[PDB]
Amino acid sequence: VTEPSAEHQVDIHTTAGKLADLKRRTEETLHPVGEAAVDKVHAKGKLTARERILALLDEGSFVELDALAKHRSTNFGLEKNRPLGDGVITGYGTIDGRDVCIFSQDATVFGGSLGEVYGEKIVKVQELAIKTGRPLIGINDGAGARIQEGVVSLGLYSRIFHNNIKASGVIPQISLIMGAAAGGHVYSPALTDFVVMVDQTSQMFITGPDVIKTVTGEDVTMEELGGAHTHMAKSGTAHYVASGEQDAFDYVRDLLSYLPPNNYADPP
Amino acid sequence: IRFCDSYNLPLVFVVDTPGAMPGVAEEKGGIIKRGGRFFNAIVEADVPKVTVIIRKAYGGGYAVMGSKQLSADLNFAWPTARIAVIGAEGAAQLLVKRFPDPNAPEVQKIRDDFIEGYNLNMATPWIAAERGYIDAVIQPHETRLLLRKSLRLLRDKQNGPKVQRKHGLLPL
Amino acid sequence: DHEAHIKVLRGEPTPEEMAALMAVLASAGERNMWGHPVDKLRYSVFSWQRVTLLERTHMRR
Amino acid sequence: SKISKVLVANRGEIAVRVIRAAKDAGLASVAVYAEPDADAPHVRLADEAFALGGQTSAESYLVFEKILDAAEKSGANAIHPGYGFLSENADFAQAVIDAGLIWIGPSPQSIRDLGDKVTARHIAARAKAPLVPGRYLDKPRHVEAQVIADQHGNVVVAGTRDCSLQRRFQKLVEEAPAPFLTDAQRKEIHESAKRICKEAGYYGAGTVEYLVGQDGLISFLEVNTRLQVEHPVTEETSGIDLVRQQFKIANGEPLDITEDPTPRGHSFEFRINGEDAGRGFLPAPGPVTKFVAPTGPGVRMDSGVETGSVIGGQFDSMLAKLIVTGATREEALERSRRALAEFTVEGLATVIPFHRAVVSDPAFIGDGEKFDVHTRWIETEWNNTVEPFTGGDPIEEEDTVPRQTVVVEVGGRRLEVSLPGDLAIAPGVVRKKPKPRKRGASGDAVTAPMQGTVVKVAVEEGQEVSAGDLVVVLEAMKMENPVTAHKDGTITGLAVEAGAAITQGTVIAEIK
Amino acid sequence: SKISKVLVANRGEIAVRVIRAAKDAGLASVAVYAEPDADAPHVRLADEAFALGGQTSAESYLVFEKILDAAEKSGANAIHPGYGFLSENADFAQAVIDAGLIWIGPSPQSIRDLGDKVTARHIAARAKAPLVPRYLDKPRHVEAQVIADQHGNVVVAGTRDCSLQRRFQKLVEEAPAPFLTDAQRKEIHESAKRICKEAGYYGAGTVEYLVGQDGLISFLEVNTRLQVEHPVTEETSGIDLVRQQFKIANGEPLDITEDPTPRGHSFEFRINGEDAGRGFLPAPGPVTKFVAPTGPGVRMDSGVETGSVIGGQFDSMLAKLIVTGATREEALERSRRALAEFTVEGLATVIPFHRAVVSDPAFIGDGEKFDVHTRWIETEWNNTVEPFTVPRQTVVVEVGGRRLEVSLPGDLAIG
Amino acid sequence: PRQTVVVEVGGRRLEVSLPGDL
């Protein structure tokens, strides 16, 4: 029985077929919510979570971790939609030849909302950064806890915070805010050493305009509430407001160029 | 392991094992206690630990050959890897096959179909990858450069938190 | 001789051009542990890093 | 009937060549590919491609039922057999006709008759071919006559070829027309070919092959019924498109060509096999990390691989054919010297260095009225200067030092210079001769020395064997690799069986 | 008195072609390059290469003193000017002879005469070349490839059709010229010998003519160079025209003694970096993928390869595809294949136009005539094509009797 | 100023004068 080349797949019962299967799954990780979502993101002129890492790091230095991870929640039918990576891309990479650990949250997957495996992946990269004594870069773009998963999300946020605390004053921690960081997402940047934001497009807010409106009558746009300008001039959480993603990455490489890898290494 | 740790040699584990050898001479020879020593040594060791799973890694073999549990630092598998509590033959011979009385060609094909399912859905790396027990599934040719990058990252590993003591204790 | 030499992969210079090339290329080509950061870190009395960082710094040569 | 849609079944170069001929015909073309060939150029080039299964040729391309299934599924109405597998398999040709497909080739009757060595001798006698008397030939020259024949019995001798540069009775370099032959010899060979073909009742393209003794005695050697891999030097000198001519014949049309075309100039062909000529002409698998074709005046390439191809150990080593043509044999050699100077192939060993060598050798240049080459000259008289392939492997201590390559302009001369990364013109780095990636034994395991297929198993379970006794034969790249017992003892475990694909280091058996 | 080392004075395809011819002759091949061409293949194919400096033809390649400087530095005993640039500069030819190098080409006087329309027409009339008084409404362009000799032997290697033109730029060319009557062929051939013998040209060149629907041959011009279209005649008649030029410049008399009989038919297709869908506007850009057609009937000459960055400073042409067959229709079929196999990525090319015209019934003649003419692309072809969508350091060093520039990359972690 | 150096190439003596500031 022969087949057209469009249908045929090498026999999974062979080493070559298993390797081909790995290639298929890897490819499938590049567009875990389908190519349409990536097209919809580029149409707005924004990089994806993968492209942001590949742009920030040195070329080819990125080694991805937990690429094939899938969530395990069965609440409210989530078992029907289990995108690869659970919506965060994680690994380690050199910047200017010096190793750093990195994570980058993907807004296309459940709005970037933090869930179980998503949190476990961030935790793993944090632990690796602390044990190795290398800077940690967080690229943040998610709206809150994934309310479908519930309390799990809050426990993982607690774990992430605790790791950021342990890391505080040990390794340089740099947060890039690249979209609407809402809810618990905001507190990890606040614990990290430097906050870089992208002027018109990043936001940080704990309570959203809808709830502000409901409780106070004050009606406010996200940009007024928690835009980069607001957090620079009024609140003062933000250390840099970049004209764009590339400028932000440049600023982060500058900061790293001044910072040592750890509290005991000799500086550059 | 303990020698390498005392002289700061990183540990690279290349795994291809069904685990412990079942038998009476092994049991009478102390396989439980020796394996306990191996379990202890691999967690005592503070050096960078990296693992490459080649084909089967079952049971205590998966555990002691630098799982992420027992605190190996980076875990890679080739796509041929097979991570499970037991191989397909053992799982079938244990749970499935003992319900029939006969070695009939019924049980022969039912067993072969169970093997067929288990070697795909269970004794494959994808569960471990989904759960993040291994960190990556990699094409084999990657391995040399990937080890270089991994050990370069882990070169300055400081292990902890550990509580200082006179010494650990080892099944002896 | 196992030294790594320069190698003119392509073309031949005359001796005068080789002399110019080589002249141009040639013309182009203690412990003090006092206040080391590891002393400045604050350790728990039982912290393993007292072995694996602090001694492994002070003793290391 | 007429060809409207072809299916080919061959890999690499000849699949590409027949796809190209079909497109020149405007015929739709269907490729079939084994599991290793999913990336090969012919799979992309054909108008569609159908998967064959299995790793080996014996699984993928030798199975009649898979090719006939693919012809049915693709709706192809004709079959082209290519060089290797089924072009003389009369049983396949019969099953094809039994399918109602057009067989682009000779009748199964004539395939079987000329394949039978004794029947072929009888036919030659009946044709009054020049038969070698008796005699053995000590330094024979291997000549040949490309034939075209329609189903109506018109036969044309499209030209001669010289194929005398051989190893293991397998050709490396060939040239057309056969040089330094008397007109009497040429006329003899032409007449003989036409007679043998009509007497055999042959139609389709085919080649009659002869040996020339040092005394000029022509002898008919064999008929090969299938466009031989060397047809290009005939196409280039004669100007014929021999594959289209196969199409025109298979359509049942009479030959256009009324009389034997006069050759223009001369042409050489060089087989770019993936074989290390610095070792014993041994085929080796590997990646094609770079492939840049010779280009420009008088140069044709027919190539089965591209940059990023992988040649596995399961199929013939022939990567490409380089064909070079000129107004005279002298000019053709000059152009060949250029083309082979321009050729670069990287990531696996090729015979390109041997081609470069031989096109410079007086024994093959000749005195202008004869040359010394004969069918054993490569094995017995060519001084093999070629050094073994090593690629980039660092082998001496100085090779381990990183190197930066720069372009330097000195008086305008574009020099290119490699600068060592530590030259005094790494605080505690040591350089020493790196050890080869080789296992430098007493162990019980018999292990496979390379990847291949297990074409024969010699031992039986529980047999006792002695050091040097045969255990298995591995086919690798259609070369026999007998694997033998390293110590005396009993075969006490045995995993292999005939036809199994086998990877390097596989434990074949345990001798205890 | 004999060539031993040729400096080829151009870039691109003609540089590659002459370097190759010199390697076939066993001559030493010297190239020269402008800075935008320092990567280009001919610099790496030649046995020796010299920088010219500067960014433009007027800086790099047209400066006589630079080309003669590089000839002196290389010890090249002969100059080959290729085509274009200085190939028709009689003053440069004279300068080279003053320099005592072999000038591989026609005499300065021959260039200076045949380049001037007045004495060109005088020589044509004297020679009794066909020369209609009149206008040609759909003229077809046909030219004779001359191989002349210093001894005054002449061979006409072949009649060539170059009638697919835009703004007099040729794009598809054929040999032998099709659908001519044998009387027209004879008239052209004899006219070419007469006119070139009278002009005294001794080197390879082409005599162009126009043919009207009246069938009247009219002389146009003599190019005085081995013109870019030569490969079609090389594939048709087997003569290696560059090696013939080397022989002539050696002054060895022609060994070819009669007009070589065409083997068959050939077409040349120029691969310009021009956007046929965009009025053939040139556009610069990177050649991020280049994959020539290959195998039966194809010859490829290319000045570029994958990763070449093309700029507006020089000729827009990248490569030439030549396709040969026994018959016109076979050659067209093979062309229709080869142009489908040809992939170029990252810049606009005329390949889509070749795919069209080799498929167009105006160009696929009925077997007795075809409808194409030197205005056909502009005025009659349906243009259906979808339009296409740090510095190096230098040090000045004296050494003995010489002063030299030495140049290094803009940064250098030497040692 | 120039800096002058004496280089031996295969034993052939050559003088070289190069910029006093490379």
Coordinates of C-alpha atoms in Angstrom, one line a residue, chain A residues 95-232:
Chain A
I95 CA 24.0 37.9 25.9
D96 CA 27.3 39.3 24.7
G97 CA 28.8 36.0 25.4
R98 CA 27.7 35.9 29.0
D99 CA 25.0 33.3 30.0
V100 CA 21.6 34.4 31.3
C101 CA 18.4 32.5 32.0
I102 CA 15.2 33.8 30.4
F103 CA 11.5 33.4 30.3
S104 CA 8.9 35.1 28.0
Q105 CA 5.2 34.9 28.4
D106 CA 2.9 34.4 25.3
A107 CA -0.2 36.6 25.3
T108 CA -1.8 34.4 22.6
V109 CA -2.3 31.5 25.0
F110 CA -5.2 32.1 27.3
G111 CA -4.2 35.8 27.3
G112 CA -0.9 34.9 28.9
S113 CA -2.7 34.0 32.2
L114 CA -0.6 32.1 34.6
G115 CA -1.5 28.4 35.2
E116 CA 0.1 25.3 36.7
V117 CA 2.7 24.2 34.2
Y118 CA 3.3 27.8 33.1
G119 CA 4.2 28.6 36.7
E120 CA 6.3 25.4 37.1
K121 CA 8.3 26.4 34.0
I122 CA 9.0 29.9 35.4
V123 CA 9.9 28.3 38.7
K124 CA 12.4 25.9 37.0
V125 CA 14.1 28.7 35.1
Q126 CA 14.3 30.7 38.4
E127 CA 15.9 27.8 40.3
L128 CA 18.3 27.3 37.4
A129 CA 19.3 31.0 37.5
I130 CA 19.9 31.0 41.2
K131 CA 21.9 27.7 41.3
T132 CA 24.0 28.8 38.4
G133 CA 24.4 32.4 39.5
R134 CA 23.4 34.0 36.2
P135 CA 21.2 37.0 35.5
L136 CA 17.5 36.3 35.1
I137 CA 15.4 38.1 32.4
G138 CA 11.7 38.0 32.6
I139 CA 9.5 39.1 29.6
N140 CA 6.1 39.6 31.0
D141 CA 2.8 39.8 29.1
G142 CA -0.2 38.1 30.7
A143 CA -3.6 39.0 32.3
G144 CA -3.7 37.5 35.8
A145 CA -4.2 34.0 37.1
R146 CA -6.0 31.6 34.7
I147 CA -9.2 31.7 36.7
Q148 CA -10.3 28.3 35.3
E149 CA -7.4 26.6 37.1
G150 CA -8.0 28.4 40.4
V151 CA -6.0 28.2 43.6
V152 CA -3.1 26.4 41.8
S153 CA -2.3 29.7 40.0
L154 CA -2.0 31.5 43.4
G155 CA 0.3 28.9 44.8
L156 CA 2.6 29.2 41.8
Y157 CA 2.5 33.0 42.0
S158 CA 3.6 32.6 45.6
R159 CA 6.4 30.3 44.6
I160 CA 7.6 32.7 41.8
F161 CA 7.5 35.6 44.3
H162 CA 9.5 33.6 46.9
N163 CA 12.1 32.7 44.3
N164 CA 12.4 36.4 43.2
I165 CA 12.9 37.2 46.9
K166 CA 15.6 34.6 47.4
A167 CA 17.2 35.8 44.1
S168 CA 17.0 39.5 45.3
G169 CA 20.5 40.8 45.9
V170 CA 22.0 37.5 44.5
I171 CA 21.6 37.7 40.7
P172 CA 20.6 40.7 38.5
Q173 CA 16.9 40.4 37.8
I174 CA 15.6 42.4 34.9
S175 CA 11.9 42.6 33.9
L176 CA 10.7 43.6 30.4
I177 CA 7.1 44.5 30.3
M178 CA 5.8 44.0 26.8
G179 CA 2.0 44.1 27.2
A180 CA -0.8 44.3 29.7
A181 CA 0.6 42.7 32.8
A182 CA -2.5 42.5 35.1
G183 CA -3.2 41.1 38.5
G184 CA -0.5 39.0 40.2
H185 CA 1.8 39.4 37.2
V186 CA 2.8 42.9 38.4
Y187 CA 4.5 41.8 41.6
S188 CA 7.3 39.8 40.1
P189 CA 8.6 42.8 38.2
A190 CA 8.3 44.9 41.4
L191 CA 10.5 42.3 43.1
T192 CA 13.0 42.3 40.2
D193 CA 15.9 44.8 40.2
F194 CA 15.1 46.7 37.0
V195 CA 11.8 47.4 35.1
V196 CA 11.9 48.3 31.4
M197 CA 8.6 49.1 29.8
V198 CA 7.5 49.8 26.2
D199 CA 5.8 53.2 26.0
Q200 CA 2.4 52.8 24.4
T201 CA 1.8 49.1 24.7
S202 CA 2.9 47.8 28.2
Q203 CA 0.7 48.2 31.2
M204 CA 0.9 47.2 34.8
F205 CA -2.2 47.3 37.0
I206 CA -3.4 45.3 40.0
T207 CA -7.1 46.1 39.7
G208 CA -8.5 46.7 36.2
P209 CA -10.5 49.7 35.0
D210 CA -13.8 47.7 35.1
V211 CA -13.4 47.1 38.9
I212 CA -12.1 50.6 39.5
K213 CA -15.3 51.9 37.8
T214 CA -17.5 49.5 39.8
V215 CA -16.0 50.4 43.2
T216 CA -15.1 54.1 42.7
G217 CA -17.0 55.5 39.7
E218 CA -13.6 56.7 38.3
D219 CA -13.5 55.8 34.6
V220 CA -10.0 55.3 33.3
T221 CA -8.3 53.8 30.3
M222 CA -5.6 51.1 30.8
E223 CA -3.1 53.6 29.4
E224 CA -3.9 56.2 32.0
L225 CA -4.2 53.6 34.8
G226 CA -0.9 51.8 34.2
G227 CA 0.9 52.8 31.1
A228 CA 4.6 53.2 30.9
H229 CA 4.5 57.0 31.3
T230 CA 2.3 56.7 34.4
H231 CA 4.6 54.1 36.0
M232 CA 7.7 56.2 35.2

